[PDB]
Design an enzyme around this catalytic site. Structure first.
Site, PDB file in Angstrom:
ATOM      1  N   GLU A  35       0.751  -1.492  -0.141  1.00 41.50           N
ATOM      2  CA  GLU A  35       0.041   0.266  -0.029  1.00 41.50           C
ATOM      3  C   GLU A  35       0.916   1.124   0.098  1.00 41.50           C
ATOM      4  OE1 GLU A  35      -3.060   0.349  -0.465  1.00 41.50           O
ATOM      5  OE2 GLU A  35      -3.839  -1.675  -0.267  1.00 41.50           O
ATOM      6  N   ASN A  46      -7.928   9.071  -5.922  1.00 40.50           N
ATOM      7  CA  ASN A  46      -8.653   8.438  -6.175  1.00 40.50           C
ATOM      8  C   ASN A  46      -9.597   9.152  -7.371  1.00 40.50           C
ATOM      9  OD1 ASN A  46      -8.609   6.576  -3.598  1.00 40.50           O
ATOM     10  ND2 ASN A  46      -7.866   5.716  -5.422  1.00 40.50           N
ATOM     11  N   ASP A  48     -12.708   8.873  -7.880  1.00 43.60           N
ATOM     12  CA  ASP A  48     -13.811   9.573  -7.106  1.00 43.60           C
ATOM     13  C   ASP A  48     -13.766  10.758  -6.597  1.00 43.60           C
ATOM     14  OD1 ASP A  48     -12.372   8.295  -5.116  1.00 43.60           O
ATOM     15  OD2 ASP A  48     -14.196   6.631  -4.592  1.00 43.60           O
ATOM     16  N   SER A  50     -11.917  11.020  -3.723  1.00 44.94           N
ATOM     17  CA  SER A  50     -11.341  10.630  -2.475  1.00 44.94           C
ATOM     18  C   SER A  50      -9.653  10.639  -2.505  1.00 44.94           C
ATOM     19  CB  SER A  50     -11.927   9.186  -2.200  1.00 44.94           C
ATOM     20  OG  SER A  50     -11.386   8.315  -3.007  1.00 44.94           O
ATOM     21  N   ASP A  52      -6.322   8.149  -0.537  1.00 47.02           N
ATOM     22  CA  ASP A  52      -5.780   7.102   0.504  1.00 47.02           C
ATOM     23  C   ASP A  52      -4.660   7.762   1.299  1.00 47.02           C
ATOM     24  OD1 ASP A  52      -7.830   5.629  -0.792  1.00 47.02           O
ATOM     25  OD2 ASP A  52      -6.260   4.882  -2.334  1.00 47.02           O
ATOM     26  N   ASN A  59      -8.910   5.410   3.409  1.00 51.67           N
ATOM     27  CA  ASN A  59      -9.549   6.246   2.369  1.00 51.67           C
ATOM     28  C   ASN A  59     -10.559   7.234   3.107  1.00 51.67           C
ATOM     29  OD1 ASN A  59     -10.339   6.359  -0.596  1.00 51.67           O
ATOM     30  ND2 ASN A  59     -12.491   6.623   0.496  1.00 51.67           N
TER      31      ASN A  59
END
Ligand code: NA
Length: 129
Positions: A35, A46, A48, A50, A52, A59
């Protein structure tokens, strides 16, 4: 902070992840490797809208508040920037909520694709734990 592999096992262990919800420590080191590359300060946007955050790439649509994710929840009750700390406390305590939520560690895409079903004990081999 960029952790060493055994340094982060050892820390994960101290905050109660070895075998949390039946997930042995290697699963977690492996998730953190793929990750975040082991770096508390990793951020990734991301599609959308969002983002991380941190060592486990948690998220902002559901778990933390970053002030720029419309209609999102903050299920861990912390700003997202808390997740970038050299102290992995808040990341761990939020991760325990996420892994509890129904889908286990499959909530971490990279765990699912790179760690699940592999010899994840190899991530803690050599470590004084
Ligand atoms: Na949020």
């Amino acid at each position: 902070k960029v952790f060493g592999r055994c340094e982060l096992a050892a820390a994960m262990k101290r905050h109660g992840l070895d075998n949390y919800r039946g997930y042995s420590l290697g699963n977690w080191v492996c998730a953190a490797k793929f990750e975040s590359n082991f770096n508390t300060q990793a951020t990734n946007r991301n599609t959308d809208g969002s983002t991380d955050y941190g060592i486990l790439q948690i998220n902002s649509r559901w778990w933390c508040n970053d002030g720029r994710t419309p209609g999102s929840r903050n299920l861990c009750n912390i700003p997202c920037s808390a997740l970038l700390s050299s102290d992995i406390t808040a990341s761990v305590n939020c991760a325990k909520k996420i892994v509890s939520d129904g889908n286990g560690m499959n909530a971490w895409v990279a765990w699912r694709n790179r760690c699940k079903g592999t010899d994840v004990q190899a991530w803690i081999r050599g470590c004084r734990l």
